[PDB]
């Protein structure tokens, strides 16, 4: 099946203090992100940086894994992906309410955003109150270079059969370490609290506090790079326990080539590698 | 309400779109008269919540009507609605306000609650509850986190309906979480201007303790005197008047708050304000009322 | 402004089974290398991998580092690099015996193998015999492409005044875990394994056993464009301590880009990559 992938982190907007999920980017075929006026740009390549995988492995050889949930609503997968962590001790018993009731939050759309006037990065708290994060709030690159009809356009580059796959990423102060779920269900369900055009399938869950070399976007940019590949994808389907998967992880990572900081021309720079890579994808 | 006849209808498949034409669902009934035994046998066909009729209501909108909560307690596991709006939109939140039920803002807690949502007139639940301004209503809403005081297609902000209502418990509640005390309205009406046509005198001090200017002049010059003299409610222009409020403002129609209690032929209140009220502005009916959220 | 840096790895020859240094790449702003003809290819920018980065800052966070040291011959070098891993407790002192003799080898160019024949990796034992690795080989990905006059050429580009470095991996079976030095002389020295005229100020040092996702090949290319980099190198250069080449070292990485494989690759989606390489060359300069 083809997938569709979709990315929401947590933000709040400006007119009052509320949390709640947003996208900020697709990979229908290439990434696609969204700017802060609202409008997508265009579709570009998907280059990462060496902490978000260096995260990302650390992370999924300590995560947590659901294959076949029986569920139909979102808030059942919360409860048994609730469970589990405090079974793998995870998190502390005294945090399930808190998370239980960040999950659970209203999940709002493109067409809203002109409506709530803009929205601004919301790490949560033990009591529920909102404040602004005790971080650089730097914006990205990419929003910084990609953006300074669309739905029936995007309809016909839907594939007529396809299963999405959601990513939901932040940031919250009152846990202890960065925590994953990667969860599966059983037969593809239309969730009602998250209004995506075709039914979810996979279901990923990075959370924790603000820690050094640690950046949620971009980690969460690397698992939607890592959903959007073939045979990575294709072990998903056929894994049965962690152990494929973080196979799978290191035969992935094992066919990538990283780029140095070189002052050489640029498109002479980038033309130079283009064999080396198909000779890389025929070898992986 | 007999279960084990429901049991019997279940073998033989009775579809759960049963629809009336008054747009009643099979849950509507069970959320009604509390029969809710059969809640389960629902669910055996595995019943889905979300199920809007003409007038667009939930499970939990005819629920809260008449509250069976330890229904409604497991519905929300069961795939709840958690921001249903009717077909007025409105969500459950300022409804179970209205209603007022003991538990059901605990209700809402187990999962919790939005308490800004707009609905097709724009009023928030935070505003419909602070209408009601119930006593159990000041202590949790302070869970929810919320704009304190919120406007409406008028600009009416929580504390402005306090005082229209005159209810000294939220009227406090309000100006100690940090509301504005002289909000205005798109015309420009302040809680003031809105207590002093309602003449209470309870929800005019207490906003004179909140500090809302004695003075505060709409888009078309009427203050709270002239509304305390065009209601005839001579407790609130007294009350004005002695705490500095000035008697001699025209208004964009030349009338002052003597012509106006003239004109309207209130005597007990002619006398303290003409008086009062230095020599009309201008040698001479249009009147001020302050806006409310329609129905 | 301009170094030339030299990489020799521990192999056997062709002609009889014994252990010695050859060379495998060079580096003057650019990666050239040599297959089994004995000729260089052509020069090109150097691709890194995963893994041999990583397990440079894994092997680097617990690297000894020995700062203007006054040294000018090998043996002193050999003597006192092995008494700093013996300090911080890197390798047992048992080891030692070997490891003398595992440095005291011959170090021959590519023109001398003609007649030797041609050389094949080779594992050092505790014993002192060569011997066949365990795990798996792979064809390089580097010499494939790219190998399959150049002298006055490389004397050309280097300007006539100019300090080298060297990087000597190999792989010891006697070992417990992958182990680093990094030693910067006092003053510049000529030393008997590089035939060029230059002279040597910085040197590397990196053994270790065999274990998975390591290629010493590839960490040692690893080290090679670490110490290529303008910036790293001034840094070296006026560096006191560990945690300054540690944090040199952080912002190396990054101001790295990684790409990663995909389904079907093209070059005009990936002309869009231009600005945000500068951008991080920008902020690369920018310290």
Redesign the interface.
């Known amino acids: 099946h083809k997938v569709y992938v979709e990315l929401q982190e947590l933000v709040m907007d400006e007119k009052n203090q509320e949390l709640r999920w947003m996208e900020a980017a697709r990979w229908v075929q290439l990434e696609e992100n969204l700017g802060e006026n609202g409008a997508w740009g265009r579709p570009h390549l998907s280059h990462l940086t060496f902490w978000s995988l260096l995260e990302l492995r650390r992370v999924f050889t300590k995560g947590t894994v659901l294959l076949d949930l029986q569920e139909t609503s979102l808030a059942g997968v919360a409860n048994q992906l609730l469970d589990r962590f405090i079974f793998e001790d995870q998190i502390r018993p005294q945090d399930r309410e808190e998370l239980l009731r960040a999950l659970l939050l209203k999940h709002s759309h493109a067409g809203e955003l002109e409506a709530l006037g803009g929205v601004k990065p919301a790490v949560l708290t033990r009591s529920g109150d909102p404040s602004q994060p005790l971080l650089p709030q730097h914006s990205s690159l990419e929003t910084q270079l990609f953006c300074e009809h669309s739905p029936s356009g995007i309809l016909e580059k839907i594939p007529p059969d396809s299963e999405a796959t959601l990513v939901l990423v932040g940031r919250a102060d009152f846990l202890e370490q960065p925590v994953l779920g990667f969860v599966r269900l059983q037969e593809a369900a239309e969730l009602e609290a998250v209004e995506l055009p075709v039914p979810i399938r996979f279901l990923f869950v990075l959370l924790g506090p603000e820690a050094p070399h640690i950046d949620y976007t971009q980690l969460g940019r690397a698992a939607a790079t890592l959903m959007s590949e073939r045979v990575f994808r294709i072990d998903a389907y056929m894994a049965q326990s962690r152990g494929e998967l973080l196979h799978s992880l290191e035969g992935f990572l094992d066919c990538s080539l990283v780029l140095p900081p070189t002052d050489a021309p640029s498109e002479q720079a980038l033309l130079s590698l283009v064999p080396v890579q198909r000779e890389l994808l025929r070898r992986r | 309400g007999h279960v084990e006849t429901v049991l019997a209808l279940l073998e033989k498949e009775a579809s759960q779109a049963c629809m009336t034409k008054k747009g009643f669902t099979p849950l509507h009934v069970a959320a009604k008269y509390g029969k809710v035994r059969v809640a389960e046998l629902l669910l055996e066909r595995?019943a889905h919540p979300?199920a809007a009729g003409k007038n667009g209501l939930t499970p939990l909108h005819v629920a809260v009507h008449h509250n069976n909560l330890d229904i409604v307690k497991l519905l929300?596991?069961?795939?709840?609605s958690?921001?249903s709006p009717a077909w007025n939109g409105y969500t459950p939140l300022h409804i179970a306000a209205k209603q007022n039920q003991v538990e059901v803002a605990r209700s809402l807690l187990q999962?919790?609650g939005?308490a800004?949502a707009e609905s097709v007139q724009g009023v928030t639940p935070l505003h419909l509850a602070a209408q009601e301004g119930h006593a159990e209503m000041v202590a949790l809403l302070l869970?929810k986190?919320?704009?304190g005081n919120?406007g409406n297609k008028s600009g009416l902000t929580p504390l402005h309906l306090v005082a229209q209502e005159g209810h000294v418990p939220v009227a406090d509640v309000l100006i100690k979480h940090g509301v504005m005390v002289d909000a205005t309205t798109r015309m420009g009406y302040t809680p003031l201007h809105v207590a002093s046509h309602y003449g209470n005198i309870k929800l005019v001090k207490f906003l004179l303790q909140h500090q809302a200017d004695v003075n505060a002049k709409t888009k078309l010059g009427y203050s709270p005197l002239h509304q305390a003299a065009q209601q005839g409610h001579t407790d609130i222009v007294t009350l004005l008047l002695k705490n500095g409020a000035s008697p001699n403002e025209v208004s964009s129609d030349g009338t002052t708050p003597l012509a106006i209690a003239k004109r309207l032929g209130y005597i007990s209140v002619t006398d303290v304000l003409k008086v009062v009220t230095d020599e009309t502005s201008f040698v001479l009916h249009r009147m001020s009322f302050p806006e409310t959220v329609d129905e």
């Open positions: 595995d979300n929300l596991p069961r795939g709840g958690p921001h999962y919790g939005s800004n869970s986190q919320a704009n919120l």
